[PDB]
Amino acid sequence: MAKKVAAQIKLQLPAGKATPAPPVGPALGQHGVNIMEFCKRFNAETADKAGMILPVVITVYEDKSFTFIIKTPPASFLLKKAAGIEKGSSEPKRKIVGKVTRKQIEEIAKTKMPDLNANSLEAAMKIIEGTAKSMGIEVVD
């Protein structure tokens, strides 16, 4: 399969909010890459996971072409989107700040399957759950 890797541009970038600030411009642009192609790409792709410093990895090719991936991380990311801590709880924090549910675990586990390096989702579920557990997040059902 066609690979002509010229470089790699790893970048932690706001979902829905990437831009040629010191992050992007110097990173990709120095390697000849269309920052706007990148940005209009990452932004549109990350539209859903917006509000988020996404851990990205760019792989620019010989053409000045590129592609990039975004490491849908251990679980913290979408556990915000579940545990209910996209900012924080109002006050309730019995050590368990907020919580979710095995099913919620699953979904999160599923979406980040490519990242968590899941042989099988049961494994990814462990990650999410364990992450959650460590983060003071309970799972309830």
DSSP state of 117: T
Token pair listed for 23: 């992050």
User: Torsion angle of alpha carbons 11, 16, 19, 24, nearest 10°?
Assistant: 10
Cβ neighbours of residue 38 under 8 Å, at least 6 residues apart? 18, 24, 28, 58, 66, 68
Could you give the count of Cα atoms lying within 13 Å of 72 in the half-sphere of its Cβ? 22
Amino acid at 109: A
CATH for 72-141 is: 1.10.10.250
Q: Which residue has the tokens 């924080």?
A: 88
For residue 52, list its beta bridge partners. 15
Could you give the count of Cα atoms lying within 13 Å of 116 in the half-sphere of its Cβ? 28
Residue ranges matching CATH 1.10.10.250 in the chain: 72-141
Angstrom distance (rounded) from CA 45 to CA 111: 14
DSSP state of 95: S
User: Phi and psi of 38, rounded to 5°?
Assistant: -55, -55
Determination technique used: NMR
Angstrom distance (rounded) from CA 45 to CA 25: 19
Residue ranges matching CATH 3.30.1550.10 in the chain: 1-71
Angstrom distance (rounded) from CA 34 to CA 63: 11
Is 65 in contact with 102 (CB distance < 8 Å)? no
Give alpha helix (H) positions in 22-120: 24, 30, 35-45, 76-79, 102-111
Q: Where are the beta strands (DSSP E) in 1-130?
A: 5-8, 11-15, 52-61, 66-70, 98-100
Angstrom distance (rounded) from CA 6 to CA 110: 32
Domain 1-71 falls under CATH 3.30.1550.10: yes
Angstrom distance (rounded) from CA 106 to CA 118: 12
